[PDB]
């Protein structure tokens, strides 16, 4: 005695994979002018009796963020100088004017025959290089990219400083956000809300230590696809930030050479003052409190009678074993063995991390597309917040009481996924039926 009644505008949905678009607040490498201007007053709708299941490791928003960043990165280099004329034999000697023995062998004084704006003329050039960019070819050296990639100069007018971007769902779709404090990313979320756009996310690029992200609501959160499987990385979200102060303690004079009709090359000409090693400062007390919190949360998964030991990375590319980041436009590779060297068993004194600098950069783990980072004029300093760690675990210890964690990393999707863990995209399915007593 019941009849089918059709209802349209029914508040239901399904998991879905769709295209998201970029929005930004009203140069850079994020085409932020190409992104849709944002809503000054975004809405968020709390769903009072909705429990939803989230899985951050299957979140396709991460894959899109990854592809958008790489694409935008490459687009920003399209119009820049192609420094193919630099792949020549370089004649290099050591910079010995000011040695502290930290920098011995870190800078070389190279000279070469560079092209000029006229096809029939050459010029002799003298420039300084940071060692890691230069390899011997037998005093005769070549740049490291000569046997794999054409090198493109980044445009000096375009900044690499992250600008928050927002991902927005298209009409017919919505983004559900998990508001459950202390949510580990995989499972039911008792408290959710609907938004159309994500919070602004800064595409900060780093390894090991994740800078300038979101903090845990109350306590350190240990997130992993599988804790038992040591092949997975562990993303640790910190409750409080750890301040890190990084510097390039040298006054560099930058020169510019015309190398073709509409092209010029930027390089370090000389150094004013003494020559010193780049470094980062982390307070010992803050860092010691930070690890104590991490250790406590790891014991909840590994045992209260389990010893937690930290150790330095076992090896790999410099891009993996060090803390890579970009400050002032310069690319730093800092050694974190000073942060992860202790065993944990149930005031103005800092930790100094020495750093290396590179000008030839190979991002996103690709081969064949090298970038040359122009030197930045003057003396460089930045201050940033460590808001999370990436740790890996040593396996095979089936009969031990001590677990070892190391500062691994290098896969950029892990950083993206550390902000896009509370969001999922759903398709709205407004049409449906139910029995009623109403008959046409």
């Amino acid at each position: 005695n019941l009849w089918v009644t059709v209802y349209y505008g029914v508040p239901v949905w399904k998991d879905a994979e769709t295209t998201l678009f970029c929005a930004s607040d009203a140069h850079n490498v994020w085409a932020t002018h190409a992104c849709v201007p944002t809503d000054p007053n975004p809405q968020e709708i709390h769903l009072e009796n909705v429990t939803e299941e989230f899985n951050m490791w299957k979140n396709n928003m991460v894959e899109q963020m990854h592809e958008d960043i790489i694409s935008l990165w490459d687009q920003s280099l399209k119009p820049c100088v192609k420094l193919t004329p630099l792949c020549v034999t370089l004649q290099c000697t050591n910079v010995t004017n000011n040695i502290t023995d930290d920098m011995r062998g870190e800078l070389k004084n190279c000279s070469f025959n560079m092209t000029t704006e006229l096809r029939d003329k050459k010029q002799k050039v003298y420039s300084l290089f940071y060692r890691l960019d230069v390899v011997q070819i037998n005093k005769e050296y070549r740049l490291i990219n000569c046997n794999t990639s054409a090198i493109t100069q980044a445009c000096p007018k375009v900044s690499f400083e992250p600008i928050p971007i927002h991902y927005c769902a298209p009409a017919g779709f919505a983004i559900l956000k998990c508001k459950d404090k202390k949510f580990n990313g995989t499972g039911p979320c008792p408290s959710v809300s609907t938004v159309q756009c994500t919070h602004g996310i800064k595409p900060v690029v780093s390894t090991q230590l994740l800078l300038n992200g979101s903090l845990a609501e109350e306590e350190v959160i240990i997130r992993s696809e599988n804790i038992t499987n040591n092949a997975k990385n562990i993303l640790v979200q910190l409750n409080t930030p750890v301040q890190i102060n990084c510097t390039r303690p040298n006054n560099n004079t930058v020169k510019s050479i015309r190398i073709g009709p509409g092209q010029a090359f930027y390089y370090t000409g000389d150094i004013i003052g003494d020559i010193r090693q780049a470094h980062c400062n982390v307070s010992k007390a803050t860092w010691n409190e930070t690890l104590g919190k991490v250790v406590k949360q790891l014991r909840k998964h590994f045992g209260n009678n389990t010893i937690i030991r930290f150790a330095q990375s076992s090896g790999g590319d410099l891009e993996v074993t060090t803390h890579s980041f970009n400050c002032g436009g310069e690319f730093f590779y800092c050694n974190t063995s000073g942060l992860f060297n202790s065993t944990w068993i149930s005031s103005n004194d800092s930790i100094t991390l020495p750093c290396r600098i590179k000008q030839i950069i190979n991002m996103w783990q690709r081969i064949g597309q090298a970038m040359y980072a122009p030197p930045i004029q003057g003396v460089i300093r930045c201050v940033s917040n460590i808001t999370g760690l990436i740790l890996t675990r040593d396996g095979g210890s089936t009969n031990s009481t001590t677990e070892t964690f190391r500062p691994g990393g290098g896969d950029m999707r892990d950083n993206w996924r550390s902000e896009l863990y509370k969001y999922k995209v759903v398709k709205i399915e407004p049409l449906g039926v139910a029995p009623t007593r109403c008959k046409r």
């Binding site: 009849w3 209802y7 349209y8 505008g9 508040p11 295209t19 769903l47 046409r440």
Partner: protein, 120 residues
């Protein structure tokens, strides 16, 4: 008020009173263009289907197809006001391609009958 999906999680009886809330938020470099086209296509598929069933202008449409207890054997009092639309949608997802087929058949028979009555 509540908001765009504010009635999600509310029982069906309450949620059915906010249908314009969700309806008004549907349909509202080339990645964006592709997305705009999809929004239109999805909107139109639902409207096309309501048209075929004879529900083209309605948010709530009563048809002539009887309910089969094999789809769901429940009291109305435990469907309406004791269940949400998300729960209901999962319970009968198996049967929606049957129900839709019946709705289409019903409208075709109805239109032919209307034509004959006008002719008489």
């Amino acid at each position: 008020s509540l908001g765009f999906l504010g009635a999600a999680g509310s029982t069906m009886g309450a949620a059915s009173m906010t249908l314009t809330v969700q309806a008004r938020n549907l349909l509202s470099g080339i990645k964006q263009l592709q997305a705009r086209v999809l929004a239109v296509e999805h909107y139109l598929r639902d409207q096309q289907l309501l048209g075929i069933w004879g529900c083209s202008g309605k948010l709530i449409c009563c048809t002539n197809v009887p309910w089969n207890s094999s789809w769901s054997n429940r009291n109305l009092s435990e469907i309406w006001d004791n269940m949400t639309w998300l729960q209901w949608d999962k319970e009968i997802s198996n049967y929606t391609q049957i129900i839709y087929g019946l709705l289409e058949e019903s409208q075709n028979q109805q239109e032919k009958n209307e034509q004959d009555l006008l002719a008489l």
